[PDB]
Amino acid sequence: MKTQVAIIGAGPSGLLLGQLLHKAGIDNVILERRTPDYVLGRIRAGVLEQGMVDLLREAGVDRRMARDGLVHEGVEIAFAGQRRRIDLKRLSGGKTVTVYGQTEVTRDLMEAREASGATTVYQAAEVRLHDLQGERPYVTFERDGERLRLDCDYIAGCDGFHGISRQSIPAERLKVFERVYPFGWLGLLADTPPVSHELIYANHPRGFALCSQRSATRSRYYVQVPLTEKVEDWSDERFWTELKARLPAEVAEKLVTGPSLEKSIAPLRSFVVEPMQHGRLFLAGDAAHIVPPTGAKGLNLAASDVSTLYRLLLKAYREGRGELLERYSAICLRRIWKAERFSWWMTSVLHRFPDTDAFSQRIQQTELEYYLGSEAGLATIAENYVGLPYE
Amino acid sequence: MKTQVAIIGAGPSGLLLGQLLHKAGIDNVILERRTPDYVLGRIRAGVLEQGMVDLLREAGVDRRMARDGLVHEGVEIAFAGQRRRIDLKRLSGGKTVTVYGQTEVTRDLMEAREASGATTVYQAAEVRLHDLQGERPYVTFERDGERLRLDCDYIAGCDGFHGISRQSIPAERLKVFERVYPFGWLGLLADTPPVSHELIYANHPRGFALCSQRSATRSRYYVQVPLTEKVEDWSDERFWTELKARLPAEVAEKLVTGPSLEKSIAPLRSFVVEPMQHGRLFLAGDAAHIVPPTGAKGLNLAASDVSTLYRLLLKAYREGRGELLERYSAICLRRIWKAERFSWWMTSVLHRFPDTDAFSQRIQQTELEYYLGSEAGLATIAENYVGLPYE
Ligand SMILES: Cc1cc2nc3c(=O)[nH]c(=O)nc-3n(C[C@H](O)[C@H](O)[C@H](O)COP(=O)(O)OP(=O)(O)OC[C@H]3O[C@@H](n4cnc5c(N)ncnc54)[C@H](O)[C@@H]3O)c2cc1C
Ligand SMILES: Cc1cc2nc3c(=O)[nH]c(=O)nc-3n(C[C@H](O)[C@H](O)[C@H](O)COP(=O)(O)OP(=O)(O)OC[C@H]3O[C@@H](n4cnc5c(N)ncnc54)[C@H](O)[C@@H]3O)c2cc1C
Questions:
Q1: What is the DSSP letter of A389?
Q2: DSSP states of A169-193
Q3: Between residues 173 and 192 of chain A, which touch chain B (CB distance below 8 Å)?
């Protein structure tokens, strides 16, 4: 079989790039290891930047978002008995963030592709990439026991952190930057009305807590746990008690608990690879980088890689300007690094680290005191949160 | 579930280490991505060193080998109309090589384990390794849709070149050495009596050719092909014509052709990672390194990693001397590098490289002339072929 752009992975990056490309007339096939069911089961992201909201409109998959998505004009940080709100709207010059689940964005894109008639192969086993540096690269996979070959011009690895793409580039060609945090995030999705109309990030001596939502009747809560924790050691009862314990009394007493729909632990890490391409292979999304969930930048950074990749591929096909693909990595990394720095900053100020000395604890407290108390301090959190401008 | 040593991969390395360990009283589980059928379908290796022959006896799986295996006392190299034999026996001090297929060695080990009652999980999907640097690491997998957890003390990645193990070690911790040759090997297995009682490696202007065997009525032939070749572009007819064309007339006219049982193309490469371990994770076999098939050192290097790993684990469990595991990589790499140098040497003297100048072509010819003409020259090929001593 022959396509123009072979896309590995059908999570938001692949689906979004597939839809952007198909709409512009560039044929593409998407190969996915799993079933549509498993992809749709991943809870993940809740906060979207206006950059992605616009790219979804541009890809024509925004009807449902514009109806169900909640537009948030502020966030709240809690520490040392105080609850400080950051007015994103005022401090960033009118930009905001939209809360709409990744499971939804992924569902909408899946349906759109399903209707478009563009090719998608779920349960595509043992994907191997070939002749990446050639003029004609190919992808091979197994469907029902028979090994097929797919020919294409370019390949886009949108296969997440554990994908085959990044592994297909010679090690000596990539330089890895990584940091693994000594903790994880225990999340819990409940069919209960959220404790606030805005998100409440919270620093507390027992550890970090986050009050988020999916809609007016669906919530998503998180608490920091050691990497040694097993999710089956955390009953619903225990999660509510622990969450309540880390939030301000006024917030803790308005909390409406309930059984969990989903409950899982996600480890925190920062990871960046340089460069993000190799021959006819361009990495996008988690395949190329991971950011701690603290700053809500993962899905949003994928959106920008995918926007930059699509626009360059348009020039390549539509205008024959294929030499611009060489700049993919350069453009992307400038944005990736700044979002990596924020996610790192946020993580370090909101979390309790093991074996922190008196001086560090104090500096962590003063950071929040300064930033949340200064107009210029607040403006730096706001512009970074709403999302730094796309290049 | 809880085991002592969790082994990822059930190719020869895993099976051999599982059997060596089980026999010494150390419990082990083997997780395999594929079906026993697929593993048994891989044709691969034909030549075994006396080191592995002995380790198989030590693991008690040699009845069939000692009956079906062919003990070879010499090999033959052909170039510039000459056919020079290397007497391995005389030149190495009495050592020899045994020809017995990998499919057989793998079959024998599979049956032995099957009888022993030791645990084996075929079709073990999405294996992820965890807490490698902890005191208690674990492996998670999916069997029939349900994700299980396996606890263990140590883990041995015997999952080949495309395994999850090597990918589980932080990139910044590993230094990769790699070389990809501009050609591959087109093999063809036929149920025909071999053209000679010994192997004939051959340098010819059209490219490399190798005359090998599995038994007196089963043969395995190879010819060098560009990486651009598709196996479906090579009919049986075409392979025989091409093989005949690269061999000495006297050898070419005694050839008994026939239809192919198996026919596939394998790309050539050299690959070494340093170090070969990380915390409670030790790499063995192809997971840690690849050698061009030219020198018949791949399976044999795996045998030595597995022998060194087992012996160190005996001291660790049996004698409580767990500090010796720190030397695993040091010991292994000394052997790996020398076998890598030979496989590289062999490859460079027997193959036709694209864009080779007059001087290089001549030096390639003189290398064969010198080595095959000098007593000291021949002795260097012989001692390396039969296998350099285990440390
Ligand atoms: C708890 C949590 C909260 C988060 N919150 C936010 C938030 O509020 N806002 C935000 O911006 N970010 C957030 N993030 C990040 C975001 O979820 C990810 O960056 C995003 O899902 C990555 O998109 P992706 O499409 O690149 O990869 P993925 O989502 O990883 O999907 C990749 C696909 O590749 C497929 N695949 C893998 N290997 C293969 C193979 N070999 N063959 C074929 N296909 C293969 C997989 O099965 C998977 O379907 C959060 C993350 C977590 C864990
Ligand atoms: C054409 C050819 C000829 C050769 N000839 C010779 C010869 O004559 N003599 C010699 O010494 N060498 C030779 N070699 C080399 C030899 O075949 C290999 O070195 C050897 O097979 C490697 O053994 P292994 O057990 O480490 O890995 P493998 O043989 O690669 O088996 C590894 C197993 O790991 C499993 N696996 C992979 N990933 C996972 C996952 N994620 N979960 C679970 N399991 C997983 C795989 O499905 C596979 O079953 C030859 C190679 C080739 C290609």
A1: P
A2: S-GGG-EEEEEEEEEEEEEEEESS-
A3: 174, 176, 178
Dist. CA A137–CA A153, nearest whole Å:
6
Rounded CA gap, A152 and B106, in Å? Answer: 37
Bridge partners, residue B221, by sequence: B188, B211
Quick one: DSSP state of residue B80?
T
List, in order, residues 6 or more apart from B149 with CB less than 8 Å away: B1, B138, B139, B140
Q: Are B2 and B152 in contact (CB under 8 A)?
A: yes
Per-residue tokens: B164: 């999850």
d(CA B340, CA B344): 6
Contact A164, A127 (CB under 8 A): yes
Q: What is the largest CA-CA distance in chain A?
A: 64
Q: How many CB atoms lie within 10 A of CB A310?
A: 24
**CA of A53: how far to CAs of A212, A300, A332, B7, B285, in Å?**
19, 10, 19, 46, 49
Q: Are A349 and A362 in contact (CB under 8 A)?
A: no
- Cα–Cα distance for residue pair A176/B38, rounded to 1 Å: 35
Maximal CA-CA distance, chain B: 64
Q: How far apart are CA A69 and CA A100, in angstroms?
A: 5
Would you say A200 is a known binding-site residue? no
State the Cα–Cα distance between residues B340 and B271, nearest whole angstrom.
9
Handedness of CA A332, A333, A338, A343 (dihedral sign): positive
Which ligand 1 atom sits nearest the alpha carbon of residue A301?
11
Please identify among residues 214-253 of chain A the ones whose CB lies closer than 8 Å to any CB of chain B. Answer: 227
Question: Residues A31, A37, A38, A40: is their CA dihedral positive or negative?
Answer: positive
- What CATH number belongs to A1-72+96-180+269-351? 3.50.50.60
Nearest to A172 among B170, B178, B227 (CB): B178
CATH 3.30.9.10 assigned to domain A73-95+181-268+352-388? The reply is yes
Identity of the amino acid at A212: S
Domain boundaries, chain A: 1-72+96-180+269-351, 73-95+181-268+352-388
CA atoms lying within 13 Å on the CB side of residue B202: 29
Q: What angle do CA A19, A25, A27 make, to 5 degrees?
A: 70
Question: Counting beta carbons within 10 angstroms of the beta carbon of residue B264, is it exposed (0 to 12), middle (13 to 18) or buried (19 or more)?
Answer: middle
Work out the number of other CB atoms within 10 angstroms of the CB of residue A265.
19
> Are A221 and A187 spatial neighbours (Cβ–Cβ below 8 Å)?
yes
d(CA A47, CA A175): 30
Kindly state whether B148 is in contact with chain A, defined as any CB-CB distance less than 8 angstroms: no
Contacts of A162 in chain B (CB under 8 A): 128
* Residue A293 among known ligand-binding residues: yes
Q: How many CB pairs under 8 A join A and B?
A: 20
- In chain A, count of helices (H) and strands (E)? 13, 20
Query: Which approach determined this entry?
Result: X-ray
* Cβ-defined contact of A178 to B167 (cutoff 8 Å): no
